[PDB]
Design a protein around this ligand. Structure first.
Ligand SMILES: CC(=O)N[C@@H]1[C@@H](O)[C@H](O[C@@H]2O[C@H](CO)[C@@H](O[C@@H]3O[C@H](CO)[C@@H](O)[C@H](O)[C@H]3NC(C)=O)[C@H](O)[C@H]2NC(C)=O)[C@@H](CO)O[C@H]1O
Ligand SMILES: [Cl-]
Ligand SMILES: [Cl-]
Ligand SMILES: [Cl-]
Ligand code: NA
Length: 129
């Protein structure tokens, strides 16, 4: 599923991400745009052999099991394929664990390079929330 901007903002708010660990909703929408272009089916391969999955590009080296990343962890205890669903519950629940692990949203490279320090509130302008 390819979400609309305000459609995704409303889904993330319903799942408890607005101000989760101090990160306003615009931060999460901005990260999703630049990680995946709002596409739940996005996948990308890393140099080390791991793969990033879903709307928030969660990495199989640490967070999910895809059966082909040897010596990796599965800290969210889920198959990586679950992160590609049109239902974002699994991606959101895992993201809550990631952002609590010490580095906040710096775990998302595109957030650090394209969202951090910008006016992220603009990503939710005009949305009925
Ligand atoms: C969205 C996504 O998958 N991002 C990936 C990053 O999570 C990943 O960064 C590394 O993540 C792990 C786990 O969060 C980091 O380990 C943690 O580091 C903190 C700070 O030192 C420490 O408090 C935690 O104890 C420690 N947890 C564990 C289980 O070890 C690790 O430091 C991160 N590494 C770097 C260079 O930032 C990166 C790198 O694999 O990939 C992203 O895609
Ligand atoms: Cl915001
Ligand atoms: Cl959903
Ligand atoms: Cl933080
Ligand atoms: Na893994």
């Amino acid at each position: 599923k390819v979400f609309g901007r305000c459609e995704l903002a409303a889904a993330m708010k319903r799942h408890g991400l607005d101000n989760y660990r101090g990160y306003s909703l615009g931060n999460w929408v901005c990260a999703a745009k630049f990680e995946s272009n709002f596409n739940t089916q996005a996948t990308n391969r890393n140099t080390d052999g791991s793969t990033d999955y879903g709307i928030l590009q969660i990495n199989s080296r640490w967070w999910c099991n895809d059966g082909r990343t040897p010596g990796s962890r599965n800290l969210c205890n889920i198959p990586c394929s679950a992160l590609l669903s049109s239902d974002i519950t699994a991606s959101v629940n895992c993201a809550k664990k990631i952002v609590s692990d010490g580095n906040g949203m710096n775990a998302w490279v595109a957030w650090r390079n394209r969202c951090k320090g910008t006016d992220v509130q603009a990503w939710i302008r005009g949305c009925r929330l």
